[PDB]
Amino acid sequence: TGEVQTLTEKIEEAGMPDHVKETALKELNRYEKIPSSSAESSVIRNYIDWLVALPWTDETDDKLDLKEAGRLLDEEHHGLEKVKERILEYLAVQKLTKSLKGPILCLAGPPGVGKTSLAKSIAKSLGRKFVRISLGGRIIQGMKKAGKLNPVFLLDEIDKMSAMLEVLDPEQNSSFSDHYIEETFDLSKVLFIATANNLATIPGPLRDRMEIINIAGYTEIEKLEIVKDHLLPKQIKEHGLKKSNLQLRDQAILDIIRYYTREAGVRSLERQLAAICRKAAKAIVAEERKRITVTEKNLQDFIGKRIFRYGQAETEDQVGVVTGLAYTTVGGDTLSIEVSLSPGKGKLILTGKLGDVMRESAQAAFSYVRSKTEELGIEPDFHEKYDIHIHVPEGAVPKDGPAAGITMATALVSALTGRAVSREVGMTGEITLRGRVLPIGGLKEKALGAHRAGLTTIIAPKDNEKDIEDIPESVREGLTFILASHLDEVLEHALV
Amino acid sequence: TGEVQTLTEKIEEAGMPDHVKETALKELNRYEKIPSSSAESSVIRNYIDWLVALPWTDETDD
Ligand SMILES: Nc1ncnc2c1ncn2[C@@H]1O[C@H](COP(=O)(O)OP(=O)(O)O)[C@@H](O)[C@H]1O
Secondary structure (H helix, E strand, O other): OOOHHHHHHHEEEEOOOOHHHHHHHHHHHHOOOOOOOOOOOOOOHHHHHHHHHHHOOOOOOOOOOOHHHHHHHHHOOOHHHHHHHHHHHHHHHHHOOOOOOOOOEEEEOOOOOOHHHHHHHHHHHHHEEEEEEEEOOOHHHHOOOOOOOOOOEEEEOOOOOOOOHHHHHOOOOOOOOOOOOEEEEEEEEEEEEEEOOOOOOHHHHHHEEEEEEEOOOHHHHHHHHHHHHHHHHHHHHOOOOOHHEEOOOOOHHHHHHHHHHHOOOHHHHHHHHHHHHHHHHHHHHHHOOOEEOOOOOOOHHHOOOOOOOOOOOOOOEEEOOOEEEEEEEEEEEEEEEEEEEOOOOOEEEEEEEHHHHHHHHHHHHHHHHHOOHHHHOOOOOOOOOOOOEEEEEEEHHHHHHHHHHHHHHHHHHHOOOOOOOOOEEOOOOEEEEOEEEEOOOOOHHHHHHHHHHHHHHEOOOHHHHHHHHOHHHHHOOOOOOOEEHHHHHHHHHEEE | OOOOOOHHHHHHHOOOOOOHHHHHHHHHHHHOOOOOOOOOOHHHHHHHHHHHHHOOOOOOOO
C-alpha cells in the first residue's frame, strides 16, 4: 500500500486540470518517497498539499441583476444612498466589461460606517465567496479559505503598513507569482476591495491604481433608523431573545446617541445597544418578565450616566477662543483654537502641531489685524508691545490645515479686544493677507460633525455655498449657515 | 534527486548561449549546494535566477 496513493490518487482527480502545473506536480511528486520521512522527506512533503487545494477549474456562476443587488444594499445598510448609486455603477459597468478591470475600489471613511459590510454585501449580490485579508502587518492563503477562484478579497487595511502592486496591476495581476510555491496563477476574475481611514499612509503608487469611494458618516436621523431597522434586532437576535423581549422608545435611542456616542460611524452605538441587549437578558432569565421597555428615563439604569456634552447648556461663551470645524481622518471634529496675550515683541509663537503650514496662515490673520486696526477696536501700539500665543489642536488633516484661518483670526481678535466668541458658532475658512476668505474642504463632513456636537451657527466661506446643496436634509435643517468672504463678516457674527 | 537539477537543467537549456557568462554561471553554481539553506545558502541562491531570464538570443525582428 504505502501513502504512495493517498495523495497521488486525489492528484489525478478531476481537480487539477491545467497541465502547465501538473508537470511541476508529478515532478516533485515522483521525487524521493525513497526513503522514509528523513529530514528531507518532510520538506517537499508538504509543498504538494498547498498545491492540492488551489482552485483552477472551479469558479462561481455570477448573477448580476441590478434590480436586486441595488435593493439588497437597501436591505443591509440604511442610508449610503449616494455610495450605493456608485456600487451599482461599478456593476452595470461590470456586466458589460465581461472581464473585471484594473480599477478596484477602496472604501474610505471613519471606522464603523460600514466599509467592511458593504463589501460582504457587494459580494452577497455577486454570489461570489467573501474573504477578509487583514493588512495590519499572503494571498497565498486567501484562495484556500475559499477554494473557488472567483472570490471577493477585501484588502481590509491598506494603510497600517510600515510595494505589492504586482497583485493588482491590470497588466500583471493575470500572471501571479509567490515564493515558497513559485508558480504563475490567474487572478482574472477576483473582485478586490479596500478599506481605509487616513488616506495618507496609503502609497501614492497604490492610491492611483485604485478608485476611491468615501463613506461619510450619518445624521442623527440616519443613525436612529440604522438602530431601529438593523442595529437593534441584530443585537437582540444575537443575545438570543425575542423582539417581544425588549423595545427602546425612539427618544431614548436619540439620547443614547447624543449623550453616549460622539462618533461618525455607529460602532460605539452598537456597543451601547448590546450593553442593553445584555442587561435585558439577565432580567428575562431571572425576573422572567417577557418584556423590557427602556425609556428616556430608564436609560441610566442600563448604560450608566451621561458620557458626552451636547449643546450649550453647560458651556459659557469665552474669549480669544474659537471653535473651528476640522476634517479629521475620522470625521467632522470640533477642535478649539486659543490665543494668549503676554507682553514682549511682535514675535508670535504657536503650540500644538509644529505646523510650518500653520505659521503662514497664522502670521496672516495676524498680518490682517496689523492693518485694519482702530477700525476694529484695538490699541494700534500692540504688535509692537505684546507677544501672542496660539494653540491649534492636532487632528485637521494636511489638505485642510489652512482651513483654520478665519478661526485663528477670530480668536486673535477676540483675544486682543477682550470681546468673546459666541460658544454656539463653529467656523471654518482660509485667510489671506487682505482679509479674504477663500474656499474650504469637505463642508459636508464638517457641518455633519458640527451638528453632532450640537452647535447652532456655522460660519464658512462664501464661495462654498454650492457645497451646502449635498448636506443631508436633517442637519442642514438644524443649522443656520452664515456665509462670509472677508474677516469682518465672520467677526461680526462670531463675536458679541 | 535534490533541487540540484531543477535549476541546473533549465540552465544548459537552449536559453543562455553566450559563454562569456556561462563561466560565471556554473561557477557560482557548482558553488555550495553544500550545505542546506544556511544564512549563506540563501544569498547566491537567488543571484542565479535573475540570471535565468535575461535575454540574449531573442532579437525581435524590427
Ligand atoms: N449604514 C449602516 N447600516 C447598518 N449597519 C451599519 C451601518 N454602518 C455601520 N454598520 C454596522 O457596522 C457593520 C458594517 O460597518 P463596520 O464594519 O461596523 O464599520 P467599518 O465599515 O468601518 O468596519 C454593519 O454590520 C453594522 O454592524
